[PDB]
Ligand binder design. Structure first.
Ligand SMILES: Nc1ncnc2c1ncn2[C@@H]1O[C@H](COP(=O)(O)O)[C@@H](O)[C@H]1O
Length: 273
């Protein structure tokens, strides 16, 4: 009955996603995050299997909820006069990948391999559920520091997965593909693989490879840190200029650099605790 089933924590950060808040679901003292999203600022809409009009964010999240801890799970959603209030699980303690890199700098390849692997598994889950994230980047990845588990968040720029061309994009540009920049046209998976190459470079070098349109289009990768040849191969393959020259997810996960990954919990005991 009502939204009174949630005590309200402090703010965690504002942006284009909305206003997210720490929370403590009082039904069972469970830790949740409450995201408020104004009706006015939502452009993309959709509908639930039952035929109700909601923000696409809700539609996407519902499709990706299962026992798999790799995506932020949606627990509930409410509809306020001018806003959709969302209830989401909140790991604790937690820190997003952006802040983790800001503090720690470039990651050791072993760490980057565990992290990248977990993101690959999470993206695969979304796709298998018919969802395309469209904003894969370090700010949208949460790290459960106790369990060494990564979690994909903010599907507010996402879309249903399809095999035809996408000609709309409202995700992060420096992560967007050269086909989006030159033609305003892309396909789901290839574009997703491009952002993952950006994200892998980010983890192993401490920052993203391109900042300007021309650099994206030119696709020339310069390594500013020592990075193994195998890792540079994978990155450069993900950042192939022609979409068809990019690796599939299977090809990424079968790459030599991705072999012998650490399990989440091993990852934490060695690199987080
Ligand atoms: N602790 C958290 N901090 C920020 N966002 C969170 C947190 N836990 C879950 N989320 C969800 O992740 C998204 C935040 O968007 P962004 O900061 O752009 O990655 C929203 O959809 C939130 O509801």
């Amino acid at each position: 009955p009502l939204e009174s089933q949630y005590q309200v924590g402090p703010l965690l950060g504002s942006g284009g996603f909305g206003s997210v808040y720490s929370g403590i679901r009082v039904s069972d003292n469970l830790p949740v995050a409450i995201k408020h999203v104004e009706k006015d600022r939502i452009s993309d809409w959709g509908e639930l299997p039952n035929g109700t009009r909601v923000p696409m964010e809700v539609v996407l999240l519902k499709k990706v909820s299962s026992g798999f801890s790799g995506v932020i799970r949606l627990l509930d959603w409410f509809e306020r006069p001018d806003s959709f209030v969302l209830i989401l699980e909140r790991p604790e303690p937690v820190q997003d990948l952006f802040d983790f890199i800001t503090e720690r700098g470039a990651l050791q390849e072993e760490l980057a391999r565990s992290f990248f692997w977990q993101v690959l598994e999470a993206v695969r889950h979304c796709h298998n559920c018919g969802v395309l994230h469209r904003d894969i980047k370090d700010e949208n990845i949460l790290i459960d520091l106790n369990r060494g588990e990564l979690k994909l968040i903010d599907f507010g720029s996402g879309a249903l997965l399809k095999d035809t061309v996408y000609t709309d994009f409202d995700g992060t540009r420096v992560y967007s593909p050269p086909e989006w920049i030159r033609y305003h046209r892309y396909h789901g998976r290839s574009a997703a693989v491009w952002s993952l190459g950006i994200l892998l470079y980010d983890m192993v070098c401490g920052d993203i490879p391109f900042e300007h349109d021309e650099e994206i289009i030119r696709g020339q990768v310069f390594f500013r840190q020592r990075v193994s040849s195998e890792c540079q191969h994978l990155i450069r393959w993900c950042l192939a200029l022609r979409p068809s020259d990019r690796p599939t997810f299977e090809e990424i996960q079968n790459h030599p650099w991705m072999q012998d990954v650490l399990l989440p919990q091993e990852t934490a005991e060695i690199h987080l605790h």
